[PDB]
Amino acid sequence: MSPILGYWKIKGLVQPTRLLLEYLEEKYEEHLYERDEGDKWRNKKFELGLEFPNLPYYIDGDVKLTQSMAIIRYIADKHNMLGGCPKERAEISMLEGAVLDIRYGVSRIAYSKDFETLKVDFLSKLPEMLKMFEDRLCHKTYLNGDHVTHPDFMLYDALDVVLYMDPMCLDAFPKLVCFKKRIEAIPQIDKYLKSSKYIAWPLQGWQATFGGGDHPPKSDLVPRGSSYYQEAKSSKIMESFKNMVPQQALVNSS
Amino acid sequence: MSPILGYWKIKGLVQPTRLLLEYLEEKYEEHLYERDEGDKWRNKKFELGLEFPNLPYYIDGDVKLTQSMAIIRYIADKHNMLGGCPKERAEISMLEGAVLDIRYGVSRIAYSKDFETLKVDFLSKLPEMLKMFEDRLCHKTYLNGDHVTHPDFMLYDALDVVLYMDPMCLDAFPKLVCFKKRIEAIPQIDKYLKSSKYIAWPLQGWQATFGGGDHPPKSDLVPRGSSYYQEAKSSKIMESFKNMVPQQALVNSS
């Protein structure tokens, strides 16, 4: 009810800020520019006294910041979550920098049609960085102890823009499987994803390569069919339109 | 005499931190890994209790940070240069983010041999971002008033990894020409560039595309020849092995 996110309608890029906006129980406004509605952009890029024209952009009134790593920061800081002592914030800084290292490394190849061979250059060179918060998350439930940190919101978004790229990746790391879940566990976030404000696809710009788009989608064939072909078996109370893990064999004929 | 930079021997990437290390009159150690000496790297990446293995890496003892945007930060902060009030640091944050937007946008295409047509996609789409600090730098001598800010060290390095790409670029902006100079003006930096610690080329990794390398170089034909061919004219006290701006005509024969 005052601060304005602006940015766009796309997920990854400013979602980590949005996520963080639910946890703090924060109230704010924001416009979600649209595909060809992005004509509205060029024309409104200046009337808003935007410090250094961009997207994402913030404007809480008493400031019109730009950039994404800072508007989440400043948004955070008001809640004293940036640092404690010189050697404190640098952690949430190193952590920060550590995460964007996956996030950005993902957005850099998802816009050119020369991707498909590129994911095949990081997807098999990133399992090294996924294994850094693995052990970070050990004694400390979260990424910096109990009380969450914004990098806990950037990282959870990380592995959800890379897991859409490879679902088999967050497997050789069960400590992130729990965290990445231990985050959509808090009622604040819990209710947001099932809210009329959560935005799924796209993950990276529109079209892009892995970006693509259609918002809260599905359309094409989904995991399991079955329809009438044989209603029985497989079902053992899911408690989730998700909760998969079946697997069946028999295979081939005679 | 304790803190260790580490990173590498390459300029752009961690130079902005180095620069900032001169201004504060700070004392520190650091290893400058070398080309094929980068074999020393893989093997020493772990014995140093490096929080989240990387390059650049810091280790002042009472901490072994990683990432580059944070080790300069933490290095800065000890001198109370990060922020003042919630809406203060977000500026030096927006500014920060604003600068890496040129710096990174430069390092992203300088490593693939598909560059040459890529610079030709930003070199002609960046003069928009160069014109943001132009007017920022107006009433305020520097980027955030008198007393410098680290983004004043990231930005000066910006236009010196883009000006090596296009010398004709920092021309339609004389306010950055002065700043970019008003920074190598302070004795602290002044003496550093003419020091046995300044590292010129490479700007981006080794080989790369614009990266290349040979350290404090020249080799090939330089601006003006003249030798004996006619010693006279042109010379009007340079006061600098640099200080160019001649231009002569006549052109063609009869």
Side-chain angles (χ1 to χ4, degrees):
Chain A
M1 282 131 67
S2 195
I4 354 247
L5 226 152
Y7 173 58
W8 232 315
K9 189 58 114 87
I10 264 48
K11 178 198 262 25
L13 273 248
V14 107
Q15 240 269 97
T17 296
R18 266 188 223 113
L19 241 34
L20 212 232
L21 280 157
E22 320 313 341
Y23 185 106
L24 265 40
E25 195 114 335
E26 211 84 347
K27 23 52 119 188
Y28 69 102
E29 254 108 43
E30 74 148 16
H31 359 38
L32 0 119
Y33 290 70
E34 308 284 9
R35 298 129 92 65
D36 321 80
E37 201 237 40
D39 163 4
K40 146 214 237 221
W41 179 226
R42 299 158 28 262
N43 1 139
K44 272 125 264 35
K45 175 188 224 121
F46 301 78
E47 200 193 304
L48 316 184
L50 231 31
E51 266 115 349
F52 291 83
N54 222 309
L55 257 222
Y57 64 91
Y58 203 67
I59 159 174
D60 176 24
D62 30 62
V63 67
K64 339 259 204 313
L65 254 252
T66 14
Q67 311 296 325
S68 91
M69 242 18 227
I71 68 184
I72 161 181
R73 177 142 264 174
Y74 158 81
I75 264 284
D77 293 44
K78 343 225 264 179
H79 297 87
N80 314 325
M81 297 181 128
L82 220 254
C85 313
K87 46 163 186 177
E88 251 120 283
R89 26 203 178 264
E91 198 198 84
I92 303 155
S93 212
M94 161 196 84
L95 291 197
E96 214 161 58
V99 150
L100 310 186
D101 207 27
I102 299 150
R103 271 247 89 224
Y104 282 76
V106 176
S107 101
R108 55 161 125 244
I109 60 176
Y111 285 132
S112 130
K113 341 83 188 33
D114 294 358
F115 170 116
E116 252 306 78
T117 310
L118 274 176
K119 41 140 73 226
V120 205
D121 237 295
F122 110 66
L123 223 27
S124 24
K125 266 121 215 153
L126 146 115
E128 311 199 68
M129 48 208 85
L130 281 180
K131 175 223 42 89
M132 303 230 301
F133 318 84
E134 177 66 0
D135 319 316
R136 186 74 186 199
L137 304 189
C138 193
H139 1 92
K140 22 197 102 197
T141 65
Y142 286 103
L143 251 67
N144 194 347
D146 178 330
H147 334 84
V148 184
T149 357
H150 34 100
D152 299 329
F153 287 115
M154 305 165 21
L155 174 70
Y156 162 57
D157 189 59
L159 31 76
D160 170 56
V161 172
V162 260
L163 241 43
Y164 278 180
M165 164 160 8
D166 228 45
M168 294 285 301
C169 264
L170 226 104
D171 289 37
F173 294 115
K175 240 114 115 296
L176 277 175
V177 182
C178 150
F179 161 79
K180 133 138 174 71
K181 294 185 322 231
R182 214 234 236 56
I183 210 95
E184 27 173 294
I186 17 157
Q188 352 231 215
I189 296 297
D190 196 70
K191 292 306 127 231
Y192 168 70
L193 272 43
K194 339 188 111 186
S195 170
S196 77
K197 328 236 77 14
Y198 188 66
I199 312 166
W201 237 264
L203 302 299
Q204 227 41 106
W206 263 301
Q207 321 322 153
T209 301
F210 153 59
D214 29 53
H215 281 106
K218 181 89 103 236
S219 269
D220 226 19
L221 170 92
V222 338
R224 258 284 258 225
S226 279
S227 202
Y228 271 151
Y229 314 110
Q230 212 256 286
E231 186 188 327
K233 197 58 73 42
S234 282
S235 185
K236 204 141 204 73
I237 337 138
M238 248 183 194
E239 193 112 6
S240 255
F241 208 84
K242 273 169 290 126
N243 242 319
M244 308 306 174
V245 91
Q247 214 271 247
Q248 334 104 67
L250 181 275
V251 231
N252 306 257
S253 177
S254 225
Chain B
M1 282 131 67
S2 195
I4 354 247
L5 226 152
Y7 173 58
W8 232 315
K9 189 58 114 87
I10 264 48
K11 178 198 262 25
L13 273 248
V14 107
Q15 240 269 97
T17 296
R18 266 188 223 113
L19 241 34
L20 212 232
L21 280 157
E22 320 313 341
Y23 185 106
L24 265 40
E25 195 114 335
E26 211 84 347
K27 23 52 119 188
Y28 69 102
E29 254 108 43
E30 74 148 16
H31 359 38
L32 0 119
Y33 290 70
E34 308 284 9
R35 298 129 92 65
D36 321 80
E37 201 237 40
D39 163 4
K40 146 214 237 221
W41 179 226
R42 299 158 28 262
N43 1 139
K44 272 125 264 35
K45 175 188 224 121
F46 301 78
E47 200 193 304
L48 316 184
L50 231 31
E51 266 115 349
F52 291 83
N54 222 309
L55 257 222
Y57 64 91
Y58 203 67
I59 159 174
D60 176 24
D62 30 62
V63 67
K64 339 259 204 313
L65 254 252
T66 14
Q67 311 296 325
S68 91
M69 242 18 227
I71 68 184
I72 161 181
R73 177 142 264 174
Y74 158 81
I75 264 284
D77 293 44
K78 343 225 264 179
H79 297 87
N80 314 325
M81 297 181 128
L82 220 254
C85 313
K87 46 163 186 177
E88 251 120 283
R89 26 203 178 264
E91 198 198 84
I92 303 155
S93 212
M94 161 196 84
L95 291 197
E96 214 161 58
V99 150
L100 310 186
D101 207 27
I102 299 150
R103 271 247 89 224
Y104 282 76
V106 176
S107 101
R108 55 161 125 244
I109 60 176
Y111 285 132
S112 130
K113 341 83 188 33
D114 294 358
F115 170 116
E116 252 306 78
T117 310
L118 274 176
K119 41 140 73 226
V120 205
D121 237 295
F122 110 66
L123 223 27
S124 24
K125 266 121 215 153
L126 146 115
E128 311 199 68
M129 48 208 85
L130 281 180
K131 175 223 42 89
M132 303 230 301
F133 318 84
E134 177 66 0
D135 319 316
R136 186 74 186 199
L137 304 189
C138 193
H139 1 92
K140 22 197 102 197
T141 65
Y142 286 103
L143 251 67
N144 194 347
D146 178 330
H147 334 84
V148 184
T149 357
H150 34 100
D152 299 329
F153 287 115
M154 305 165 21
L155 174 70
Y156 162 57
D157 189 59
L159 31 76
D160 170 56
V161 172
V162 260
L163 241 43
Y164 278 180
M165 164 160 8
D166 228 45
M168 294 285 301
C169 264
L170 226 104
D171 289 37
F173 294 115
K175 240 114 115 296
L176 277 175
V177 182
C178 150
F179 161 79
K180 133 138 174 71
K181 294 185 322 231
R182 214 234 236 56
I183 210 95
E184 27 173 294
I186 17 157
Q188 352 231 215
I189 296 297
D190 196 70
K191 292 306 127 231
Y192 168 70
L193 272 43
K194 339 188 111 186
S195 170
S196 77
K197 328 236 77 14
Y198 188 66
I199 312 166
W201 237 264
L203 302 299
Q204 227 41 106
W206 263 301
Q207 321 322 153
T209 301
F210 153 59
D214 29 53
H215 281 106
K218 181 89 103 236
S219 269
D220 226 19
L221 170 92
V222 338
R224 258 284 258 225
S226 279
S227 202
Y228 271 151
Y229 314 110
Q230 212 256 286
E231 186 188 327
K233 197 58 73 42
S234 282
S235 185
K236 204 141 204 73
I237 337 138
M238 248 183 194
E239 193 112 6
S240 255
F241 208 84
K242 273 169 290 126
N243 242 319
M244 308 306 174
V245 91
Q247 214 271 247
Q248 334 104 67
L250 181 275
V251 231
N252 306 257
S253 177
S254 225

